[PDB]
Each structure stands twice: as C-alpha cells, then as structure tokens.
Design an enzyme around this catalytic site. Sequence first.
Site, short mmCIF file in Angstrom:
data_model
loop_
_atom_site.label_atom_id
_atom_site.label_comp_id
_atom_site.label_asym_id
_atom_site.label_seq_id
_atom_site.Cartn_x
_atom_site.Cartn_y
_atom_site.Cartn_z
CG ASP D 51 55.99 83.67 33.68
OD1 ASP D 51 56.20 82.98 32.77
OD2 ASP D 51 55.78 85.05 33.39
CD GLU D 126 42.79 45.92 40.77
OE1 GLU D 126 41.95 45.65 40.03
OE2 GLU D 126 43.17 45.12 41.76
CD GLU D 128 49.43 44.81 35.96
OE1 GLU D 128 49.56 44.92 34.67
OE2 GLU D 128 49.39 43.49 36.24
CD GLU D 212 54.43 43.98 48.99
OE1 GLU D 212 54.61 44.61 50.08
OE2 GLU D 212 55.15 43.06 48.66
CD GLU D 220 47.76 45.66 40.54
OE1 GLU D 220 46.70 45.38 41.29
OE2 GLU D 220 47.66 45.37 39.33
CG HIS D 269 42.68 45.80 35.41
ND1 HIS D 269 42.85 44.55 35.93
CD2 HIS D 269 43.01 45.76 34.23
CE1 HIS D 269 43.38 43.87 35.25
NE2 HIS D 269 43.65 44.50 34.02
NE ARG D 340 43.56 38.67 33.72
CZ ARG D 340 44.51 38.59 34.70
NH1 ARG D 340 44.67 37.39 35.11
NH2 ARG D 340 45.48 39.48 34.84
CD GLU D 359 38.73 44.87 36.60
OE1 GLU D 359 37.94 43.67 36.44
OE2 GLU D 359 39.80 44.67 37.12
NE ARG D 361 40.31 42.49 32.58
CZ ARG D 361 41.10 42.00 34.01
NH1 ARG D 361 40.31 42.36 35.12
NH2 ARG D 361 41.78 41.25 33.96
C1 1AZ Z 1 36.42 47.03 45.79
N1 1AZ Z 1 36.29 48.34 44.86
C2 1AZ Z 1 37.45 48.73 44.17
N2 1AZ Z 1 39.06 48.06 44.38
C3 1AZ Z 1 38.85 46.84 43.59
C4 1AZ Z 1 40.32 46.24 43.96
O1 1AZ Z 1 41.31 47.43 43.53
C5 1AZ Z 1 41.11 48.62 43.99
C6 1AZ Z 1 39.78 49.23 43.76
N3 1AZ Z 1 36.95 49.92 43.50
C7 1AZ Z 1 35.88 50.26 43.86
C8 1AZ Z 1 35.29 49.12 44.68
C9 1AZ Z 1 34.12 49.17 45.09
O2 1AZ Z 1 33.54 48.41 46.09
N4 1AZ Z 1 33.19 50.17 44.90
C10 1AZ Z 1 31.82 50.13 44.90
C11 1AZ Z 1 31.54 50.98 46.34
C12 1AZ Z 1 31.45 52.47 46.10
C13 1AZ Z 1 31.25 53.32 47.22
C14 1AZ Z 1 31.13 52.53 48.40
CL1 1AZ Z 1 30.88 53.67 49.94
C15 1AZ Z 1 31.14 51.32 48.64
CL2 1AZ Z 1 30.62 50.57 50.24
C16 1AZ Z 1 31.23 50.47 47.50
C17 1AZ Z 1 33.59 51.13 43.73
O3 1AZ Z 1 32.95 52.01 43.47
N5 1AZ Z 1 35.14 51.14 43.36
C18 1AZ Z 1 35.42 52.07 42.39
#
Ligand code: 1AZ
EC number: 6.3.1.2
Lengths: 235, 463, 463, 463
Positions: D51, D126, D128, D212, D220, D269, D340, D359, D361
């Site tokens: 629906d 990320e 929280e 963690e 988070e 973030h 930051r 990032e 933020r």
């Molecule tokens: C470490 N990291 C995080 N984390 C940072 C720590 O918190 C979790 C997300 N997010 C990321 C990355 C991150 O490294 N990247 C770049 C990226 C994209 C594709 C590939 Cl195949 C690879 Cl090997 C790396 C990204 O493009 N993103 C979005």
Amino acid sequence: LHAADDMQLYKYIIKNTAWQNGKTVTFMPKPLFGDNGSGMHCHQSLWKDGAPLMYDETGYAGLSDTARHYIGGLLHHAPSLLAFTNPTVNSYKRLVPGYEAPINLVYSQRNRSACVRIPITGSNPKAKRLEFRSPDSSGNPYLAFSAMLMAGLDGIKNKIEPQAPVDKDAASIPQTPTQLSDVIDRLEADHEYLTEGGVFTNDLIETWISFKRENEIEPVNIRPHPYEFALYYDV
Amino acid sequence: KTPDDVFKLAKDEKVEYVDVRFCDLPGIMQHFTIPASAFDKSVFDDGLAFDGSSIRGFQSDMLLLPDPETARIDPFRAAKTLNINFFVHDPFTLEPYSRDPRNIARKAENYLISTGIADTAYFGAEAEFYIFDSVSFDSRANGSFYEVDAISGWWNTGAATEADGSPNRGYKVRHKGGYFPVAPNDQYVDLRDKMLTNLINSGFILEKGHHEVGSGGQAEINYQFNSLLHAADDMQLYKYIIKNTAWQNGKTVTFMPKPLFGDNGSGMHCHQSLWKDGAPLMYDETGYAGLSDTARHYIGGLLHHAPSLLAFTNPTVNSYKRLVPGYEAPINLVYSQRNRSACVRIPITGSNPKAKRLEFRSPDSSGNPYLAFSAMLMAGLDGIKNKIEPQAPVDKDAASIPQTPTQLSDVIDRLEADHEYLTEGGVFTNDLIETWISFKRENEIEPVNIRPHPYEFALYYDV
Amino acid sequence: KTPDDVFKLAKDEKVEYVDVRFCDLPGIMQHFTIPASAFDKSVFDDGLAFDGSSIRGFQSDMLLLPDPETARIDPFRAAKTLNINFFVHDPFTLEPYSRDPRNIARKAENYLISTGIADTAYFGAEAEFYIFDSVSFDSRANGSFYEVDAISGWWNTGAATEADGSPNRGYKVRHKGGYFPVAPNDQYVDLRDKMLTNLINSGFILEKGHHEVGSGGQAEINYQFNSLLHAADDMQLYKYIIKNTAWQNGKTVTFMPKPLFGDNGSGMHCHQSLWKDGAPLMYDETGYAGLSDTARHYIGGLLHHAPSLLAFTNPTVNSYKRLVPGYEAPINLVYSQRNRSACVRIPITGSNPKAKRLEFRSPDSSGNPYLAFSAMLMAGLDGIKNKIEPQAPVDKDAASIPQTPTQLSDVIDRLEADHEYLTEGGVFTNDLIETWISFKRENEIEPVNIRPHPYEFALYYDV
Amino acid sequence: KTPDDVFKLAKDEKVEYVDVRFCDLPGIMQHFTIPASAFDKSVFDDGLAFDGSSIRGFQSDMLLLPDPETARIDPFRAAKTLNINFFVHDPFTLEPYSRDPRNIARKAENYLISTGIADTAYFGAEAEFYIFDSVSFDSRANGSFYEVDAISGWWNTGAATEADGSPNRGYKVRHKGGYFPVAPNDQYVDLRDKMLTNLINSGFILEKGHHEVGSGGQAEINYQFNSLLHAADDMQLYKYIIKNTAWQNGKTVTFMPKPLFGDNGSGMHCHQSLWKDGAPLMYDETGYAGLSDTARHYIGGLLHHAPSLLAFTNPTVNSYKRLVPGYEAPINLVYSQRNRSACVRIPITGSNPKAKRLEFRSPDSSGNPYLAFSAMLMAGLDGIKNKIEPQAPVDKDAASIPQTPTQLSDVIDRLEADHEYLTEGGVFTNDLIETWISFKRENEIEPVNIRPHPYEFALYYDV
Ligand SMILES: Cn1c(N2CCOCC2)nc2c1c(=O)n(Cc1ccc(Cl)c(Cl)c1)c(=O)n2C
Ligand SMILES: Cn1c(N2CCOCC2)nc2c1c(=O)n(Cc1ccc(Cl)c(Cl)c1)c(=O)n2C
Ligand SMILES: Cn1c(N2CCOCC2)nc2c1c(=O)n(Cc1ccc(Cl)c(Cl)c1)c(=O)n2C
Ligand SMILES: [Cl-]
Ligand SMILES: [Cl-]
Ligand SMILES: [Cl-]
Ligand SMILES: [Cl-]
C-alpha cells in the site's frame, strides 16, 4: 462461509496469543481518540466453473458487467449494509464525516476514501476483485460477508448502475450515514435484498434491529458523555 | 427605573466599583470593572468604549450602553460593587449590534409592538439546578472521565468515612413516595435559605405561588415573572446568585440539563402570555381550557416551530439526555391541561382572566435566556399571523403523537431548514442564525461525536 | 510637585524610612533605605552618595538626585516608607550618567524640545500580566524543566483534589465565545480589586476609558497616560504594585511575554502623541484617519526603524514566542485603523483633535519602559526630520507586507546595523547601545541557544 | 553479492521470516514482514507490492525491489529473520520513486559515472552515541521537561543509593587529563563489547585503524568504509545494532547531536574520496597536503555549498546545539591538516596515494545518511565541474574566517536559495527539496520556536 470461520479463528488466535503473553487485545473500531481506527478491508469476487467473472479488458478498471452491477448493489444498499459491516456505536467514531474515512459512496481505483476500491492487478483476469473498505471487525463476519454478497447479487439481478467512478481526491458525492441509529433505520426501511432466497429472514432482521436499539443505541444515548461536562457544567 | 435612581443607589450604598456586564452568544455574562467615580451621566448618554474583539468574543471597537433596570448591588464582591447590564452598539452609527443577545431581546419586544398584536410579552421561568461538593473531568487520547460528588449523594451510603475523614452519618438514600423530605434527609436547608435570602435582597419578588424547593442535591427557587428582556436579565441574575452563594459556602452548582445518570434532569419551565393596553389577551371562557384565539394560535406556532425552536431552548448536546424518548419527558408536540408530558401545558387558573397563560415545558437552563425567550415569542407571533391551528389537545396519558427531535444535530438541521419566523422584523438575522449553526456543529456536536464514550468500552472492547 | 510637597507628605504620613530607588539597565528597580530623619533639603540640593559599582551593576562613586514627582507611600512595607526615584549623576562633574535609563528618558524629553517639533510627548501603556499560584524551574547537565500553575488553570480540570487537598470545585475551563466571564468562572475578582484599589491609592488616575479586566489568570488595569519620563515611572510603579499585591495575597505574578504555551501572550500597547504650546499636533480632518503630516511621518519612523526598535520594545528571547509568524500577532509593518494585526493602530476617536494618537501594538512588558518609550520617540522624531513616508495603510485583513524579525538575535543584529536615530542629540550613546548588544548576546541569546530544548527530545531522541 | 547468495544464506540459517526494510524521508527505517517461504526469485524480478500511502508516509500503490548486498541475519529477533533493504519503484512504470532516499543515493552514484569524473565514491563515517539508563519528557500548556539519566553519570556522585536501591559505589566523576579511563571508571566495557561483537557478526569489517572507544556514557565504534549507497546502508545497520544491543541489555541509546548540556556532543566525521578504474584520484605529491586538483576542487564545493549542505548533514534543531559559535566546534569554513576546528580536515596519511581523502567534520547522526552522503558528493562534483577554488588553508589555531550558519532555520533558508547543485543529473528533484524545506519548517523549526524554553523562566519570570 469458511472465510468467516477463518476470521473468527484469526481473532481467537490474536486475542489469546496476547493474553498468554501478559497483554490484552481489542478489535474495537476506535479505542484511541486522535489515532488510527481499526478497519476490515473486504476483498470480494465471484467465480463460475473454476473461472473468474469479474474481469473484462474493455470495461473501466478491468471490470465486467457482472462486477460493475455488484458494485452497483454495494453502493445502493450501503446505508443498510453497514448495519452488519459496521454494527456498533463505536464503529461511527471511525467512519467520521471529515477525514480519510471510507465513507464516500463511490467506487475508485486511486481514491483511498471511497467505499469500494478496485485494487490494481493489471491484466491477470484471476486477480480482478472489489475491495469494500468501510467494514470493521466489531461484528459478525458470517453476517457481514453474507450481507455483502446479497447486496452484490441484488445489484446483478436488477442490473443496478453505480455512479460514475471518481479517481481524483463536493456536495455532489453521497455519504454513508454517520450514526448506528441511522443505519439501523435504513436497514428497517430496506432489507428486501437480504431476504431473497430466505438467506436472512424478516424475523432475524427485526431481532437485530431490536437488539441494537435496546442494548446498544439507547444505553449509550441516555448516558452523559464525559466531554459534555467539559462543554456544559458551567452553562 | 431611571439613571437618577441608579446614581442614588450608588451614592447610598457607597459603591466603590461598577461592573460593566454584557452577554455573550452562548449565554455567559462577560464583564470589566470601572471605578465608581467614573460612573456619571456620560455613561448613559455617550456609553463606554471597549475593544471590540473583546466585546465580540472572536478575533471592531464597540460601544456599551447601560440598562438602568438591571442595576444591582453585588452581594459577593468584597469591594462594594454595582452590577449593570449593557447593550452593545456600533460606535460610529449607534446601531444596536445584531449579535448581542440583549439587543435581540429588545428587538423582539419592539417587533411585538409594531405588529399591533400586543404591547407586552411576559415570561416566567422556573429553573432547577444541582448542588455538588466537587466536579472533575478530562478527555485524553487513551482515556476520559467525569465525576460529580456530594457528601449526601445517594450513591455514597457505603462510605466508611466522608471525604474529610469525619464519620458517615447516613440520611442519604432517596425513598419512594416523597421527593422533598425534611431535615436531616434534607441536607441543604441552610444553603438554600442563603440563596433565597440573596435573591430577595437582590430585588427578586417572591409572593403567592413562589417557593424554595429541594430534593436531594437538586433545588429550585421560583419568583415573579417579568417582561421579556428583563425576565431574561432576571434569569441571568438568578443563575449568578445561585452559583455564587454555593461558591462562597464551599460548594459548586451546575445548571446543566443532565449531570446525573438515573436521576432527575434539570428543566426550565417557561410561562408566557401577551398583553395589550393593560389587559390580558389569552383568556376566553368559551375556548378549550379558557384559551382565546390568539392563545391557541400562539400554541400553534410553538408546536409547529418546536423542532427548530429547541435550538435555542435546548441548545446543548447534554440537553438531549434529559429530553429522552421513553419517560415523563416533555417531548410530545401537543398541548394539554393534565398531561405532564406535553410540550405546552395550560396551568389551571380557573376563571381569572389575568392568570391565563401557556407553559412551555421542554426548555432547560443550558443556553441563553435572551435568545430562548425571543425565539419563543417569534414562534408564537408567527403562529398568530398565520393563524396556525394546533393538533387537538390530549388530556389522557401512540405512534399518533409527534415528538421533538432527540439529538442536538437534528434540531440544528431543523433550525437551518426553518428559521424564517425568527428573521421577521429583523429580530434575528440570517447572519446570526448561520453563526449559531456553525458554532454548535464545530464546537459542540462534532467534538462530542469524535470522542469514544466510556460505555462503548463496556459494550465493545471485546468484540 | 515640589520638594516641599514631598516633605509635607513625609511629615503628614509619619514616614519612618525613605527608599532610594534607581533603575538598572535591563529594567528592574534597585534600592537602598535611609531613615526619614536624614531626608532633608540637602538630598534635593546635593544628592546622596552611594558606592558606584553598586549603582552601576558591574565590577566609580555615584551621586543620586531625587525626582519629587515619583514620591509615593509604599502600601506593602510594614515600616512606614516613602519611595522616591532618583537620577544617577557623576559626583565630580554633576553630569547625568549616560547609562541610567531615567536620564535617557529625560534626555529624550529635552531633545524633543530642542528640535522645535513639539514640547511634550505623551505615552499611555496598557500592560497585561498573569497571576499564578506557583512557579519552579531549573537547568542542569542532564535535564531541565519549568512549571507554572494555578488552582483555576484550565489544564487542571481533572485534578482529584486541589494542591491543598481541598476538593476540585470546577469552573476552570475556558469557553469559546467569551473571554471575560463573571464569577465563579472569574476566580481572581477580589485580588484584582485589591490591585485596582492599591493603584488608585498610589496616585494612578482612572477615569473615562480606564478599566480592570480579567481573563482566566490573565489581567490588565489601564490608567491615565503621562509625559514620557513619568509615564515610564508610572509603568515601573504599576508593575511594583501588581507584583506585590499578588505576593501579599499568597500569589505570584509574571509580566513575561509568554508564560503559557497555547494561551494568550502578554503585551503592552503603547499610545503616543506629540503636543506643542498646550495644543495637539496629530490631528488633521483632511488626512487619512485624521492624521496630520507630523503624525504620518512619526508612523513612517516607527515602521522604518521597527526592526531595530524591537531591541528595546521587545527585548527578550521570550518576546518572540508572542511575536509569532502565524497568528493575530502585531508583526505586520503597516499602520491601520481596523486591522488588529498591524504594528501601528490608529484608535478611532472621531473628530476630537485632542484624542488623536497612534498605538504601537508590538511591545511587551519584559524590558525597560524608560528605554522603550525613549526609543519609540526617537524613531518618530527621525521620521519627522527626514519626512519618512510609510507604506499605504491596510484596512482589510500577502508576501507583499513586511514582517518584524522573528528572533531576538535578528533584532539585535538590526540594532547594531541601524542605531543612528537613537544617538541624535546624544539621547542614547554608542557606548550604551554596544553594551546593550553585548549583554543580550552573552547573557540571553547565547545561554538559551546552547541549552537543548525539551521538545528537541520529543523530536530527536530516537533519530 | 547475488540473489543466489541470499537464498543460500536464508536456507543455511533456517530463516523463518524476511523483514522488508525501506527508508523514510527523515531517516528512520520502516518495515513489514513476510514468511520466508514467500521469499523466492519473483521477489528480485517482480518485487513486492505494498500500500503506497504506507510506503510514502503521508495520506499510490508502491513496488519494492530488494538490494541483495543489504541482506543480514537479525541478531535480536527471537524468530530467525533475514533483513533486506529495498528500493521503492512505481508499479506501472518501474521508475525509481524520486523521494526514496535509497534511490537518491543510487542516482548519485550513477550520476558520478555519467560525468566521467570518477566511477566510485567512497564514504567512511565515524558516528558517536550516548548510552543512558532512562529518558523522559513532555510538553504541556503550563510546563515542560526532559531528563536523561545514567547510574554512572557524573551528575550523580551525591546519590545516597542508586535507582534500584543498591549502594552508590562511586567512580562516576570525569577527570581532567584523560577521556578514556579503564574500568571501573569505564562502566560500559561489557556492553560496548557486545555491540562490537554484534557488528562483526553482522558483516562489518574491522581492521587496521578501527576501534571501540568509550568516554563516560559516550561511545563510538568505527569500521571499514564503503561505496556511497552501501556506506549509508552500513550506517543505518550500525545505528540499528547499537540501539538494539542497548535495548536488549536494559539500556537506551541516543544518536541525537546534543543530549547533555556541558558535555561533548555526538558527531559523525565523514571521510570521502573519488576513484576511477581502480585508481585513486585525490593524491598529488606536489599539491598542498598531497591533494590533487580534483581533491582541492571537491573541497571548494564542500566549503562553498556548506551553508545549504548542512540542511542534510546537520538536519535537526538539536544539531545547532553542537555546532555552537564559541568552542572546538567544526564550524569554520576552511580546510586544514592540523586544525581540529575546520569543516574539512585532511587526515595525515603520508605518501601512500590510496589513503588520501578528505574528512568532513561538521555532520552528525541526526538525519539521513543516504541524503547526507549524496548531498556531500553533489557539492564536491559541482566543485569539480566549476573548478571552485577554496580559501587558503589554515594550519594555525579572526573575523576573517567565515562560519556555518548557527540555526536550522538559517540553513533551510540557504538550501532554499541555493539547491541547484543538488538537482544536477536529477539526483535530488526540486519537488523533494521543497518537501524537505516544508517538513523542517512546519514540523521542527516552528514547533520548537513557539514553545517557551525552561531557561526563559529563569531569565524572565520576574521581569
Ligand atoms: C581509512 N578510511 C576511512 N576510515 C577512517 C577511520 O574511520 C572509518 C573510516 N574512510 C576512508 C578511508 C580511506 O582510506 N579511504 C581511501 C581509500 C578508498 C578506497 C580504497 Cl580501495 C582504499 Cl585502499 C583507500 C576512503 O576513501 N575512506 C572513505
Ligand atoms: C404566575 N405566573 C408565572 N409564574 C408561575 C410560577 O413560577 C414563576 C412564574 N409566570 C407567569 C404567571 C402569570 O400569572 N402570568 C399572567 C399574568 C401576566 C401579567 C400580569 Cl399583570 C398578571 Cl396579574 C398575570 C404570566 O404571564 N406569567 C409569565
Ligand atoms: C486615551 N489615551 C490613552 N490611553 C488609552 C487607553 O489605555 C491607557 C492609555 N493614552 C493616550 C490617550 C490620549 O487620549 N492621548 C491624547 C491626549 C494627549 C494629551 C492630552 Cl491633554 C489629551 Cl486631552 C489627549 C495620548 O496621547 N495618549 C498617550
Ligand atoms: Cl447511534
Ligand atoms: Cl448531537
Ligand atoms: Cl534569539
Ligand atoms: Cl532553527
């Protein structure tokens, strides 16, 4: 018949599952003020020799002559039909004159506000059916389903033509009555279709009318409503 | 009574304030207060200016003119106060505002004169009320309640102690055979007497045939009739005095038609007669029950217009809990001399022509006496103008006799369909009638309708 | 009124103490007390010395000079006391201190004279308030609440017993159709009368057009206007008398714009007119609504400066809960004669030239009447000097009509961007305006902003 | 992952029911349930009818198509259940419904490809949250409150006994110098581990750099990024698992931006990068902070569109209690490597080209990750197409630096004025943006606005 048996068993199972788990269920149409009421949408179709009778590519919304006339019956007899499909005083707290309420005596394909809706099922003939949206779970599914069929059958026998369907969302469109006492009056005035083939008897209909008047309509009527004290204590 | 009479009263009583009173549409008196030193001749001549969204009750400037006949010392207010009722006028045109109930009553009296039928309409009212100790209620999403209570209420025989912890002393039960037992069964003697005293001190006239009566928590004090407008002023003052005598003595009064289920409702019997050149018009030895052609035709009007008339005489949803299809209910559209079940009763008054009158028994105290009395007169006057013949009277106690409608929504529909008689002479306006219909539909009929009734849970929770 | 009048009052009344009063910036009166025996000529001539961090409100010596017109017997203080308002002067220079609101009102009046436009500005104010039985609130790390309450509040119909354990007697519900019902619906009659009586005993003049009004717990008592400075003195004294009459009778009053959600806010309608050589300047038969060129230009100034003007007439965060974008709210920057929705209304006064005036409807009682009245005059004066033409008036009830800003922070921004008109003649100083802007930002706007609102939990806890 | 993978999971796990999930506009997942025996190939090919006033959220028939990548065993439901997310399609046309957030995220990904700029957009978040023991609140005519509580909350050091009557054992106070103390200061160790375990069991990948963390009641757990659409699916599943792990252990979790006054808010973030043909596009040794032209332009887009972008990344009134004008708040419209306090931060990743990313933020968890991620990509893509140059980066910690708006109503205004970039390629439609603007104004901004804040009583009751 067995659909109605299924409904009784449904309610039985729902109520008792709740009960065994420290809860309590109601099927009453309107237990909460300012929250959704509880309805019972009823899908209906007629079949002969293993084949469906409701479909026709050429008709509006895929409806055959038999289907359209069935609808004619439902809409024409609705004011009396509600005595069985919406048989309680509390029913009319759901069927209220100013909302999404399925109270408009028209059929439609898009309008979720019409008594009769035709669910969109495409070109599969077997699926074609009509959905009566007004009913609730407050009464007797044996009587309600029977009464609906009788209205439909009277519609077919007398080739009753329904008003033009309405697909868009004034004083032009007729309403279902808004009180149980009104629908009981309408049942009293027009129950000929229910007695065809002796399905319902005049005896039973008079009993039903008495019961609702003496045990339901009048006992609610004579008792001051709490909101009347808010309105009137200080007149 | 003249302006000078009022100033003399103000000076003699050493009045400190003057309370400016005017009636709203549903029937509650409104007020603001001015120092007595600002109450002079210019009040009677020019009037008092007041914000006109405040005077009108909805969300322009209005002018208020005093009625010297309605001036009374307030017996409840600590600061010595004179109460006076006013008429609402447009400030520019000095035109009487068409939605002020007091103007409507005045217009009704002037209309009467202008038809030549009579020059005075007299109204006598007998209004019942209940005295309670407490009331509470609410209306929520998941539930609703009300509760009225009284120490002496018959439903309380079983109480281990009273609400204040004092012992139950009995004398609460209503017995068969007598409605008005003496003390201690009568538990409101002193309070009722205080009400009586306050009415007499406030200029109510109690003479032959006037009495104070009590039955359980229900009571009535009747008093001498008056001309239409001032009769309604009297009713407003009556209610004011009864409610506030109760309030000052730790009680709370209601005039609602049906506060108690399975106990007497509260009605307002309305006596009516027309007079011309100091002589009565209702009597004729030769007519049935001593009624002249003018009287019979007035009755004709009442009975014919009753279905719409109740929109003013019985204007609330709760009214229809009293006017109920299976009792002693004054719902039968006939006139009678013996049947205490007919809309119109002719009190037995013998051959004294002055006393001859008709009693309309259906009304209650829940609305607006200015509108109710006016509406009744208009029904009667339409009856006279069109020589409407009432059904044959009924003196004995089936489907033959027509009923008043049983719901407010029905009587509002009937008002909508048939209000021509009320607009004659511009007494009521189409504008006002449409407003009244809207108000009752949107604020009263619908809000009650959409709310589940507690008894629906007893009937239906387990369907 | 002269010094000798005041000494005579002191001696006749056998005054024991004299209360030295002065206004702080946000608008609360401050005081200290001296024995009556030390209240002599040298108070009027030399003034009273007082620690100047105490007089200034932040953390040097200041001199206080009395205004004889403001002398009044305190009706609440057990020891017989005379209250007098003072101006704040520098001790060395005798210069009026530029941040004393009373000086600012005086500067405004003198500036008016010096422009030759007029010699007197009259201000009339009608200020509403609420009477409650109780208030409590707090703001903590993990939660926050407020609660205001009254026995007769309409939200209390369901109470089993009152706060003191006495029974619920009803008469609480607000009805449609009438805002000012009589007792027992009116549950504050005696208290309001006490307030009225105290005002009259305190030299307030109540004559034609002045009244005491009540609606539920809300009330208003209006009184005769006055020249700018003393009108503001009158407002301070009004609030003082209302608050303390309530206090002495076991109640508590608030003048906050919006204490109740879904009920009427509390406003202060401000009537204004300019006069020269004993003659009115606002009237002209030929102009729209009887308004002279001077009047129209004054209006022009009010409407042009409104967005910044509200920084003084509507100076709190709570103000903007009354001035809300979708109601009857006086937020529309137009003038009108019928529209009870426009900032500026022209009361209908006919052809009497003396009565002609303009009513600024937006203000509330939450700030400083000395600053509010001054700021209003300056807007009007800038409007005259620059012959500012207001938009065409609107007498009928879309995106065409400009609005007042909807938040305090916005009106503070607008004040910061446009305060030139306030500094004319040095009435307000840039120093003061900057201080006002700081104070509101740091002490009011930001502290509310950083605190989660209870309804945010309803909306968002489960996101 | 393919349809067959899903059927294999269903069979292996002996699934009894399938939960049909779809996202509503504000960001809450909706569901209905079917028996597993009706989950077959015709679900992937034809879809499920339901629906369409129920699917749309306002008061026609809609078709739902499963995304095999989102299939997961529900760890909480007693009956063994498989959860799958669906796209909403029109039944007749098979067209993706323009107001299903999942379709919008899909349209965003397809649009990226069609511009030739890149083929994959990766989002890492990320998020929280707070763990509490209780929450309650209401909003009434005469008062209002909220209260969140936790046994170990720092405001509870003085409690004589705990809520269950057990003794206060201390270890509640937050100390200066360390946000992540070990047990017993850390009072949520086992619960957080349960959350971690459930995430891992639910297909979340935790490797190098994933952890963690807990601080008082705040926590988070971060996890491996994903392509845009599925990253948003992961976020929804993350919140689902956190909320229900808490619920099953007698606790209650909120992701609201600011539940505690004077304690850390909860942010999200968002890491972002673009990739083409299995190769990164964000790196360049020669550019500032290792950023390519494409990266810098993407940042240009974010910073230029930020005021409107926050309508999706910070979509609640409560969001602006975290984004507050005087703190560490990520409100400064600059990019940085060390600060930051900037909207856009470039995490330091050395010379590894694959790791280079930006990032954002500012965002929080209060809205819809499908819309937020999409909106962020569209800002970045508009930045690349129009080669938008960002301001010079800031590596050191006045009026020079532009801010994000400080109120939801402001960012909604900015969205209304500048949403052209969101409609490119038909990703967002004008219809949807108007609906979002209406919704926030009528259901969030205004309802908070009209309700007095508790702190207003502290500030103004006594004005
Ligand atoms: C470490 N990291 C995080 N984390 C940072 C720590 O918190 C979790 C997300 N997010 C990321 C990355 C991150 O490294 N990247 C770049 C990226 C994209 C594709 C590939 Cl195949 C690879 Cl090997 C790396 C990204 O493009 N993103 C979005
Ligand atoms: C007794 N009574 C009551 N009461 C009946 C008992 O309860 C109070 C009203 N109402 C009356 C009458 C009543 O008698 N009449 C007739 C009437 C009219 C005018 C005059 Cl000058 C005279 Cl002397 C008599 C009337 O016209 N009305 C309206
Ligand atoms: C009636 N009124 C009110 N009240 C309206 C009702 O509430 C109280 C204020 N405020 C007024 C007026 C008001 O009439 N005027 C004009 C004005 C000014 C000076 C003189 Cl000598 C005279 Cl006779 C008249 C004014 O200038 N103001 C300011
Ligand atoms: Cl009924
Ligand atoms: Cl009704
Ligand atoms: Cl603000
Ligand atoms: Cl906002």
